[PDB]
Design a protein around this ligand. Structure first.
Ligand SMILES: [Cu+2]
Ligand SMILES: [Cu+2]
Ligand SMILES: [Cu+2]
Length: 439
């Protein structure tokens, strides 16, 4: 097939994407070996859903797993009656998710399980897929003429032909795997046919971080989690935390082979160590460098000029409340807290008012990175760690290194009960989640 593996795409037809999608243990060939994963649509990753604003999505999820599950439409500002984090689809049962794609939306989003307590094993076993919202901006020549690819960054570990089980230490750190894959393939080769590439990036890992760098090239950031930037932003590297998305332009200036690497990154994962005195926790340190893919430039490459502008970011109304949400950890217990509390599905933690804007100060007082995710209501990151954020774009995950405070501008959109949580999904399963009610 094509030298570059990418998930199969399902496009909306006539303004409607209607599809039956089963969650099922699936035998398949993965990184040169046979394994049984948990998949949507018989594939890992699941199929990419490509839609346009104002399309209708009708996704009937059939649960063929031996455990209950549900779907989070990660990043979509839709009703929490649809993106329902509390719904349980029992084994053998089905549920139809139906929503309209918002008019003012563009970018790379994704779908995955969100049944509290089972998210980490279900997502690790392979239940995830992408959703792309096409934009009229994609028709400008600087984007139209680029060669576009989706890169689903997800790692895996196999044991006896199945996803490796979670250990106690996995529940503390978040589980990372030794197979560091792109679109389910082990270090694929991308033989570019155009000198400009448009790469949609998805970190769908449970916990692994990707400190992205392309040999000999900068990246041109054009979209964050949930929308375009106002203009391209040149970066030498790009950290993608669990759950985050980004889109970059790559401008191939010379012929040659270039590595896309996940450079060493210390996210504060811990191990255990015993030097006489009994065992005590010790930092794992930075991750080993990983090669993600091989990028081959075309002959005599003449890249397109970058777009001068993308999408103006909306001027938001003045905020009416400031929230403070403090993240803490009890590592040896693998318990994780927001303002000193663990998740309780019956407890409402924040009550806000639709169509107002709030300032959320999220403070990481732990020692690990925690990627903070808010459902339903995309936000503008104003600052992290006291540094002004270098661009304006909708995000829905923000990474917090130990000690850092992020200031977020949060317009409240759809009414109903939704959640916020760490997107190291083990931490969510172990209690680092709270409930927001919007009325
Ligand atoms: Cu998510
Ligand atoms: Cu969630
Ligand atoms: Cu966390």
């Amino acid at each position: 097939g094509p030298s570059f593996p990418e998930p199969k795409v399902v496009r909306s037809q006539g303004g409607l994407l209607s599809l039956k999608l089963s969650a099922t243990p699936t035998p398949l060939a993965i990184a040169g070996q046979r394994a049984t994963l948990l998949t949507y649509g018989g594939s890992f990753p699941g199929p990419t859903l490509r839609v346009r604003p104002r399309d209708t999505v009708r996704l009937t999820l059939e649960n063929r797993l031996p455990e209950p599950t549900n779907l989070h439409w990660h990043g979509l500002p839709i009703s929490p009656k649809v993106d329902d984090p509390f719904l349980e689809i029992p084994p053998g049962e089905s549920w139809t998710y139906e929503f309209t794609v918002p008019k003012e939306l563009a970018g790379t989003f994704w779908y995955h399980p969100h049944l509290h307590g089972r998210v980490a094993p279900q997502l690790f076993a392979g239940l995830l897929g992408a959703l792309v919202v096409e934009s009229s901006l994609d028709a400008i020549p600087e984007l139209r003429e680029a060669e576009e690819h989706l890169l689903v960054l997800k790692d895996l570990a196999l044991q006896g032909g199945r996803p490796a089980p979670h250990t106690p230490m996995d529940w503390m750190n978040g589980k990372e795997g030794d197979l560091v894959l792109v679109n389910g393939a082990l270090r694929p080769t991308l033989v570019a046919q155009k000198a400009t590439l448009r790469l949609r990036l998805l970190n769908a890992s449970n916990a692994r971080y990707y400190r992205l760098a392309l040999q000999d090239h900068p990246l041109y950031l054009i979209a964050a989690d949930g929308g375009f930037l106002e203009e391209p932003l040149e970066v030498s590297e790009l950290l993608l935390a669990p759950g985050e998305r980004a889109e970059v332009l790559v401008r191939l200036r010379k012929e040659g082979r270039f590595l896309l690497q996940a450079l060493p990154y210390d996210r504060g994962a811990m191990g255990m160590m015993d030097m006489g005195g009994m065992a005590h926790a010790m930092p794992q340190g930075p991750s080993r460098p990983e090669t993600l893919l091989y990028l081959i430039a075309p002959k005599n490459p003449k890249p397109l000029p970058l777009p001068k502008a993308l999408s103006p970011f909306p001027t938001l109304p003045a905020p009416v409340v400031t929230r403070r949400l403090v993240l803490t950890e009890d590592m040896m217990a693998a318990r994780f807290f927001i303002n000193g509390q663990v998740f309780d599905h019956r407890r409402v933690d924040l009550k806000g008012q639709a169509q107002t804007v709030e300032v959320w100060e999220v403070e990481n007082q732990g020692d690990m990175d925690h990627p903070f995710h808010l459902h339903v209501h995309p936000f503008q990151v104003l600052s992290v760690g006291g540094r002004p954020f270098p661009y304006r774009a909708w995000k829905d995950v923000v990474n917090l290194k130990a000690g850092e405070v992020a200031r977020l501008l949060v317009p409240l959109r759809e009414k109903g009960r939704t959640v916020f949580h760490c997107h190291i999904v083990e931490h969510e399963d172990r209690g680092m989640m709270g409930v927001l009610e919007v009325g």
